[PDB]
Amino acid sequence: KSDFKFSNLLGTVYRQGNITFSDDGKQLLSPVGNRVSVFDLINNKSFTFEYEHRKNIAAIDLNKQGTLLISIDEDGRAILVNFKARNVLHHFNFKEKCSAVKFSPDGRLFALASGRFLQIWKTPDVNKDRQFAPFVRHRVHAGHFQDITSLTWSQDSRFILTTSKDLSAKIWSVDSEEKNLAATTFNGHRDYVMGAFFSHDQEKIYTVSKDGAVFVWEFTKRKYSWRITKKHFFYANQAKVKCVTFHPATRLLAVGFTSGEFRLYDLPDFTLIQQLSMGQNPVNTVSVNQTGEWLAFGSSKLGQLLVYEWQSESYILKQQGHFDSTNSLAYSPDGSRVVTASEDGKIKVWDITSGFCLATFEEHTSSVTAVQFAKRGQVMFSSSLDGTVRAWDLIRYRNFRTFTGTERIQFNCLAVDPSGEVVCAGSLDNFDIHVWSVQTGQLLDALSGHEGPVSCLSFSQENSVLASASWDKTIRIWSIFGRSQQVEPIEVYSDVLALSMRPDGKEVAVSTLKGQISIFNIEDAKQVGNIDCRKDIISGRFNQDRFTAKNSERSKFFTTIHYSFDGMAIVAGGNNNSICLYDVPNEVLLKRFIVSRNMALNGTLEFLNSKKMTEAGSLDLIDDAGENSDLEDRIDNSLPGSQRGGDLSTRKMRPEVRVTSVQFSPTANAFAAASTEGLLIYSTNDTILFDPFDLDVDVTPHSTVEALREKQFLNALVMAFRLNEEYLINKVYEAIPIKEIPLVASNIPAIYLPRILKFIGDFAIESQHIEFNLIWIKALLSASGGYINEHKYLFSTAMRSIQRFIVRVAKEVVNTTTDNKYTYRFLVSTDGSM
């Protein structure tokens, strides 16, 4: 009930750093601004690592055996990851800024380009235990004049070449005896050399620079050593190369220009194979597959990632996250689609299983501020600051109507009736709850009576009344259906915002500005319980702050509440660094979540460091843009009052951490919070926890398998729920025959019914047994369907997951069964030819 853990960072597919593939073409690893995200483009499943870095990720390299992952921070905080174990092995601190990480193709030892030095270390063995000092450095090579900016191993495991911020680029042999074989210094580039590569043979080295020059170095005469055979020029007039990569087996360069174009080249001839363009973003990261036919391309300032096969002129995924901008959230009724708002106006239907957006909706010019769903998820609504509330389809991907006000006032929140008839929205400016019909786009009336802005609205799913949270410190209940037209105020202590209501539809959860969360009853307007919230909130002291984090009154409240669909829990999230999960009738918190750990974000720390205040000014508040070597990032267009603006170059500060919209998942015991870092998803689906229920001395896992031997099927299954271990439940569930299913399911006790329906809905989503699982669903629902009707809210998370299972994976099998049968009937019984 309360063993939640981080499982997926939906959205923000790429932020900065070195995107890479696996040794196979399956896994794609992308550096998100905190942690490594592991997607899989063959088996469509995503995964985000639970460990947190301290700042933004600089470089990422995976071992060629797919076992060890090294992710290095921008300040050199190296973190080992046992990749299959998905846990942390060691926390190294490289003292300088590191720029490139690459293992050898052998995988025994890896090279690090940190500072002006190249550091070669021996990789620790994975099967050895977690030792204190697993890192042993082979050598350090210091023969350079400025910072090393690129690294490339050989196709063998003995030659390492590095290109630096100085004009030269040197080849260093990792063996001591072979120092005479490879010690020459390649130079002559007019600008920033940021990539050299061995050819398919060890003989040639192709060096790529910033100015557009590719130099081909060949070991020949005018003894004789390392002349230049031919130079090649990109002729990009103002576009500069940002990074390059080169698969030697397919002899393909893939260059990245800062204008937005990327080109593909065959190296002994220098022919442009394909040149495409993303947009106006600089191509910050280029990587190649091991097989040399998949190219992973990524830009930073729009946060997009593009994996493109070079052979067929067609992408595979063109995804684009958006940092800092996800204003709102809305789950789908099936727990597989989560849509989100953006400051760009984009409404993007993300997918849970693979962390990529399905469809985008850009028809709002202004920022979309609230997003909600209605009527089984086929229709969906969105409010923006543009002066409109827009319906959408998820079947034809188009708006039905664009409802508007009488003068196009702004909008704060949106709410919908559970039947698709009435939409409503609230405003900062006019503070009257406008209502529209879904059918007729004209507005019906303006439900008014408030002093100051209506903050949040929600319709009741049973009584069909709406509750308004307002800055009048009053909760207003509007009964707008069926000749009632009556207004009921429930006034609270302080400035109440972010209302939420139970799926039972008889309670109102609200979040006051004073910090406390109150819970009322809609029909009986007295207060039936409040929970204090001010103490368990981490209000991060900003770097521009001039007060302690104790009396920092900035984010010591909650501005997001949503109930659990069971009606038993409340997730409270706010402007703070904390996500809290309260229990409703027991008044106390369950556990508290830290959303992010990043001094790249503002409020991650209550205690700032004392070595950062000088005698004047904080050290990290010092505008250090001028020390950069380029022009476009040196350009400052920062407006003075760009608090939550339209870009990030206008900010002049670092972004602040906050969560702004949290909803529980309706299926799989999870909840998703739209954060500054993106869209966090905490889930309990790992189920590695010993949760018992009425255990005894005799009941053991040995007693489970023994009861399966003597075929006491109900005694095996019910006493398997006593341990409530998932493999123990899975052992008895897949072993009982079909004919003993309806006798077992008819006599399962009423206590274990929410456990079996949660198990069947969770297991059958990814399981090949459609026919077996749907036999169990038929037998359970036809022998105990009265109890599930009598207690709907106890089973509503599990019952939604079961009907998710039959619709999403089992219905289209029936659709293909019907489609194949009907086209067979036509083709074999009708006309011939000629």
Near other proteins by CB under 8 A: residue from 351, 421, 488, 606: 351
- 51 contacts other proteins (rule: CB under 8 A): no
Between residues 274 and 552, which has the closer beta carbon with respect to other proteins?
274
- 792 contacts other proteins (rule: CB under 8 A): yes
Q: Which are the contacts of 414, defined by CB distance < 8 A and separation ≥ 6? A: 370, 371, 372, 381, 382, 383, 389, 423, 424, 425, 457
Binding range to other proteins, per CB under 8 A, among 35-43, 134-142, 478-486, 659-667:
35-43
Between residues 525 and 807, which has the closer beta carbon with respect to other proteins?
807
Instruction: Give the C-alpha separation, 4 to 684, whole Å.
Output: 5
Instruction: Give the C-alpha separation, 89 to 126, whole Å.
Output: 9
Q: What track of x and - describes contact with other proteins for positions 359 through 378 (by CB under 8 A)?
A: xx----xxx-----------
- Within 13 Å and on the Cβ side, how many CA atoms surround 249? 7
Between residues 73 and 566, which has the closer beta carbon with respect to other proteins?
566
State in angstroms the smallest separation of the CB of 123 from other proteins.
28
Between residues 299 and 518, which has the closer beta carbon with respect to other proteins?
299
Between residues 582 and 759, which has the closer beta carbon with respect to other proteins?
759
Q: What track of x and - describes contact with other proteins for positions 617 through 646 (by CB under 8 A)?
A: ----------------------xxxxxxxx
DSSP annotation of 7: E
State in angstroms the smallest separation of the CB of 160 from other proteins.
22
- 653 contacts other proteins (rule: CB under 8 A): no
CA-CA-CA-CA torsion sign (690, 693, 696, 698) = negative
Between residues 42 and 697, which has the closer beta carbon with respect to other proteins?
42
Between residues 41 and 160, which has the closer beta carbon with respect to other proteins?
41
Binding range to other proteins, per CB under 8 A, among 103-111, 462-470, 552-560, 803-811:
803-811
Query: Are 395 and 378 within 8 A, CB to CB?
Result: yes
Strands 388-393 and 402-404: antiparallel
Residue ranges in 209-248 that form contacts with other proteins under rule CB under 8 A: 248
Residue ranges in 294-313 that form contacts with other proteins under rule CB under 8 A: 294, 309, 311-313
- 497 contacts other proteins (rule: CB under 8 A): no
Between residues 17 and 248, which has the closer beta carbon with respect to other proteins?
248
Instruction: Give the C-alpha separation, 772 to 488, whole Å.
Output: 52
- 402 contacts other proteins (rule: CB under 8 A): yes
Instruction: Give the C-alpha separation, 730 to 446, whole Å.
Output: 55
Size of residue set near other proteins by CB under 8 A: 130
Q: What phi and psi values does residue 103 have, to the nearest 5 degrees? A: -70, 160
- 791 contacts other proteins (rule: CB under 8 A): no
Between residues 568 and 770, which has the closer beta carbon with respect to other proteins?
770
Q: What track of x and - describes contact with other proteins for positions 320 through 349 (by CB under 8 A)?
A: x----------------x-----x-----x
Residue ranges in 726-785 that form contacts with other proteins under rule CB under 8 A: 727-728, 730-731, 734, 737-738, 746, 766-772, 774-775, 777-778, 781-783, 785
Between residues 424 and 720, which has the closer beta carbon with respect to other proteins?
720
Q: What track of x and - describes contact with other proteins for positions 426 through 455 (by CB under 8 A)?
A: --xx--------------------------
Near other proteins by CB under 8 A: residue from 237, 271, 551, 614: 271
Other C-beta atoms lying within 10 Å of the C-beta of residue 261:
16
Distances (CA, A) of 449 to 251, 400, 410, 486, 507: 72, 30, 18, 12, 22
- 818 contacts other proteins (rule: CB under 8 A): yes
- 521 contacts other proteins (rule: CB under 8 A): no
Return the structure tokens found at 686: 């790992």
Burial of 439 (0-12, 13-18, 19+ CB in 10 A): exposed
State in angstroms the smallest separation of the CB of 296 from other proteins.
13
Between residues 398 and 591, which has the closer beta carbon with respect to other proteins?
398
Longest CA span, the chain: 102
Near other proteins by CB under 8 A: residue from 172, 460, 788, 797: 788
Between residues 130 and 778, which has the closer beta carbon with respect to other proteins?
778
Return the structure tokens found at 231: 């130079």
Instruction: Give the C-alpha separation, 73 to 668, whole Å.
Output: 34
State in angstroms the smallest separation of the CB of 456 from other proteins.
17
State in angstroms the smallest separation of the CB of 712 from other proteins.
19
For the sheet with 347-351, list strands across it: 329-331, 337-340, 347-351, 357-361
Instruction: Give the C-alpha separation, 294 to 143, whole Å.
Output: 35
Near other proteins by CB under 8 A: residue from 272, 444, 613, 619: 272
Distances (CA, A) of 645 to 323, 343, 559, 638, 641: 12, 8, 20, 10, 8
Instruction: Give the C-alpha separation, 625 to 305, whole Å.
Output: 26
Nearest to 169 by CA among 199, 206, 138, 140: 206
For the sheet with 507-511, list strands across it: 497-501, 507-511, 517-521, 527-531
- Within 13 Å and on the Cβ side, how many CA atoms surround 530? 15
State in angstroms the smallest separation of the CB of 831 from other proteins.
4
